[PDB]
Design a protein around this nucleic acid. Structure first.
Ligand SMILES: [Mg+2]
Ligand SMILES: [Mg+2]
Ligand SMILES: [Mg+2]
Ligand SMILES: [Mg+2]
Ligand SMILES: [Mg+2]
Ligand SMILES: [Mg+2]
Ligand SMILES: [Mg+2]
Ligand SMILES: [Mg+2]
Lengths: 240, 93
RNA sequence: AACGAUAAAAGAAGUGAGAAUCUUCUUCGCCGUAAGGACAAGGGUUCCUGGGGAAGGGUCGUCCGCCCAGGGAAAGUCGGGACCUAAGGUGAGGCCGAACGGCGCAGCCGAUGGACAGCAGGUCAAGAUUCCUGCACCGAUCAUGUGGAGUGAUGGAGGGACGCAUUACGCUAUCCAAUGCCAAGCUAUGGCUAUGCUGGUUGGUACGCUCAAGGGCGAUCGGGUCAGAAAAUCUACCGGUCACAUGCCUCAGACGUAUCGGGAGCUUCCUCGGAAGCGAAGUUGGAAACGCGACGGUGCCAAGAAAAGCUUCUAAACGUUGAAACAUGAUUGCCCGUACCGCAAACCGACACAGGUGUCCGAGUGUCAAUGCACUAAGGCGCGCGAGAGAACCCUCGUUAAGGAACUUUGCAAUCUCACCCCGUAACUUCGGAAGAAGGGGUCCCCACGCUUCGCGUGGGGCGCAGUGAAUAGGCCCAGGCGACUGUUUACCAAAAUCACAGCACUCUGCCAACACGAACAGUGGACGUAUAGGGUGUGACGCCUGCCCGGUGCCGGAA
RNA sequence: GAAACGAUGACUGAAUCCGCGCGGACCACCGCGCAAGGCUAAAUACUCCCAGUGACCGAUAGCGCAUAGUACCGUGAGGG
RNA sequence: CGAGCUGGAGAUACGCUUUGACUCGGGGAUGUCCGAAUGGGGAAACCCACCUCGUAAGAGGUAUCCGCAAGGAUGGGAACUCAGGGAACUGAAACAUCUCAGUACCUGAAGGAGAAGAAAGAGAAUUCGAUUCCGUUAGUAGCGGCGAGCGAACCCGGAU
């Protein structure tokens, strides 16, 4: 609703359908969100209003800084219009404050967590997601991620106080095909409804199934798709 | 130059009736422009042009001999002069 | 066999070697939300005139969209360009790759979008918002005066700038009525003698102490640098002062005066028919847009392009002795498009083909409404063989005694039913439905009385076999299978019980995500998303539920 | 293959003339030769074109064409 | 060259030519716009510019890659040449190594030719004396699911 960009639809890369499905949609505009917040250290901002944001799930908050620079931030669960928000290491454990993990107390619930100092927020961004802090190790802090995974994130990285907005994606029951169309194209086309050519679940005489695999080769219910990577050392306890 | 550009005068009955109103019509170089065409008439005939309207025109005959045919491609320029009209005497043709 | 829709055709006159077919006159009939009219695409001279008459034309041609020659096409303002950007294309530098090449920031190209100055008429045989007459407008260079000092970017900001449904007030295009006005005459068959009949009944521009719904708006001073790279007198933010109604600003349109125009028709000439000259009236009442006022109001979630033009700021620069802005004169006005066909005999369909083709306008009467249906204006057309006959049979129709499904694979087909108003209406239910359930009644004309109309209600009376009097116009019900539902499919034998679906589950994926395209340590999709997210696989609304077996196979896990 | 020798993508890596490489694993002897720099005419090949000739054709032959890559077909490549 | 000419053109009119037309042989001079295409754009043959000289007409320039600069490169060639990349039908009476074949095709570079070339060689006479080509050795030697089948070189004769 205030100084945004044009998000143009596209589901194919260099030419080909690369992410299966994906189509319809109500033609949305892009709102730039301050995911990092570092440069606004020390400066206080007023919550002008909580706006609607397609592209997200998390409600959007319009910040009116004292220096008159306007920015958008993911609205946390609780933040009301006419409240103050401050960025920088100097920050209270109050809603919407941006403060690095070292200054963040243990047992605290956070969202919009970084991964590398800078870049911007990368974890717990969608509505109702929380990061439970477990307690410091060195430069690194052990954190509980929305999945249940415990990661070693260095205290040098920012976070925002509280859980994400838009309360609950529950009473949202879609309703009918076509509600799903206001967003993404004729969903999941069963490979069992396909032909031998098209997919491995193709063919046979009637309704069936025989070895359980995806579109291309592989296998689908249980198969560690994660690789033998370096980011593994900075990670302790995964599953559930 | 001046003397080129205007290939020939428009014959017909409509041009000859326009002649009588101090309106002169010519077959000009297709590439020639309004400014260039106005200049050449103003010069070669010694008369001020108060207005120029112009437009391009195609071709395409054959009579016999399955010799495909071909266009010819012209441009016709029609000019109006102030009260001090007339071209040479080459108007009452 | 056929001569390409069952929308007809008749006679007269003409022309010519020759006439069902060409011209002309009078009729007839078909379309009329089109079978009329205006674009766009596309085609290319098919247009107009004069000639022709081999072949093309399903027949015939004297004719033609065919053949020959000549002509016709006119723009500062309409489309496009010399302006802008979207998807996409390209792309110095740059990132990759046996080669050829693939990617890619800015930038540039790219309308289907933004932006931007002209209207009313006239008329060639054939053009017209282009020519012509009338009176406007836009920008540029200079001149003469007003004026007296800034002007303000390749960068800042504002602004351009955007959805869907619904809806209040005002109006216009436009349409109706009349014993309003103006004009022409005459009518007689029985009557009317005009209060009958026909036709016309206002477009542009300028000004106006005239009416006017609607619509748009804050103005200023100051503070903080931590914001717009910097600067800013511009913008944002915070604070102070007057921000009810109002108050300013804007007039859609109406009215009036003027003026240019047009106007039914009349007047003369007539070389077979056109040219020229003249010109009346301009009422009251009713209806009324998808257009205009306008960026109105409300509601809603699926949350509704960009960039330039523009308006406001300073930087640098020239200049403050000739600034910007205004006013009036002159000058200037580039390139491409414009004929014609354009729901079609000129485009795509091998044909002058019963198909297909995007947008706009699309009158009247009747009928709740309407772009429906019937008839009909304007306009266009009778579909490029014809004439007899009145057999079998075949196609498309009308009626049908008595019976009424007995037909048959199957009521397939074809009837019945049919609109609006009133009464009335079941099991069953997700309490919405089922429902137009089922069933029954009314419907026309005249008069009188009442009211809320275009019309309606009550009373009495009339006519016919019959009153949605013709056209458009549900047959209904009981029980089951399957699939919850709307939707989607085999262009061209399958429309479904197929697929999809909302919902449920298993599962993988911690972000240079899994997964996918790829020559590639390129690049991109996933995603400018982040586990309330994304991939895969299955089941398939909702309700109650989903048991037993882990030997084989697969997946996750341990390791003597 | 008993597979020498050339060649090189990956890893390594020497000698310098009582020195190096070769002689079809490999050794010794006998013998042939000097890599890790570059050029180099002629003899060879082909025929768009030109001339000459022919137990080559003479209009369904000969080139697709007595000339046309036209007419015609196809969105196009192409075909003809 | 020495009288005709005015293209095919079967066509009339106007003319030209012994002060030597016409034609033929050899040079020049003009050569619109597109095309490597090269100012910028572009849907080839069209739009739109700027800079220098200039009385307007009009003339010249404005692409990237090499190098100081002179000067060179882009693009086109029927087949032939070398290079990078490289099929399958087919044979094997099936097929998989093998064959077809490093053929066809694509791509690069070039010329009238190219390629190759001046022995760390051939090779068994202590012969030879750069390369290419032709005959020959020779279907020998050998390779080979030892199958289908594939197939050298030295000597010698010869072109140069
Ligand atoms: Mg791009
Ligand atoms: Mg008949
Ligand atoms: Mg008889
Ligand atoms: Mg049953
Ligand atoms: Mg169904
Ligand atoms: Mg359905
Ligand atoms: Mg013969
Ligand atoms: Mg030829």
């Amino acid at each position: 609703l205030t100084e945004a960009l044009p998000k143009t639809g596209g589901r194919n890369n260099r030419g080909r359908i690369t992410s299966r499905f994906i189509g319809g949609g109500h033609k949305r505009l892009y709102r730039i969100i301050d995911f990092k917040r570092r440069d606004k250290s020390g400066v206080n901002a007023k919550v002008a209003a909580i706006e609607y944001d397609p592209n997200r799930s998390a409600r959007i908050a319009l910040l009116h800084y004292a220096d008159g620079e306007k920015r958008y931030i993911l609205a946390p669960e609780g933040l009301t219009v006419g409240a103050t928000v401050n960025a920088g290491p100097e920050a209270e454990p109050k809603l919407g404050n941006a403060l690095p993990l070292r200054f963040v107390p243990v047992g605290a619930v956070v969202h919009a967590l970084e991964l590398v100092p800078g870049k911007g927020a990368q974890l717990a961004r969608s509505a109702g997601t929380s990061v439970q802090v477990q307690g410091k190790e060195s430069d690194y802090v052990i954190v509980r991620l929305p999945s249940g995974e415990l990661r070693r994130v260095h205290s040098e990285c920012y976070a925002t106080i509280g859980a994400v907005g838009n309360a609950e994606h529950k009473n949202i029951v879609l309703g009918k095909a076509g509600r799903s169309r206001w967003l993404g194209r004729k969903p999941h086309q069963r490979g069992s409804a396909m032909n031998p050519v098209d997919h491995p679940h193709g063919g046979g005489e009637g309704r069936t199934g025989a070895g359980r695999v995806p579109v291309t080769p592989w296998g689908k219910p249980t198969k560690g798709l994660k690789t033998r990577r370096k980011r593994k050392t900075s990670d302790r306890f995964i599953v559930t | 130059s001046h003397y080129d550009i205007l290939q020939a005068p428009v014959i017909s009955e409509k041009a000859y009736s326009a002649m009588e109103r101090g309106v002169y019509s010519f077959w000009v170089s297709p590439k020639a422009t309004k400014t260039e065409i106005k200049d050449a008439i103003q010069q070669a005939f010694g008369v001020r042009v108060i207005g120029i309207s112009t437009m391009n025109v195609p071709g395409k005959r054959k009579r016999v001999g399955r010799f495909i045919g071909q266009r010819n491609d012209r441009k016709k320029a029609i000019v109006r002069l102030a009260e001090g009209q007339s071209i040479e005497a080459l108007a009452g043709q």
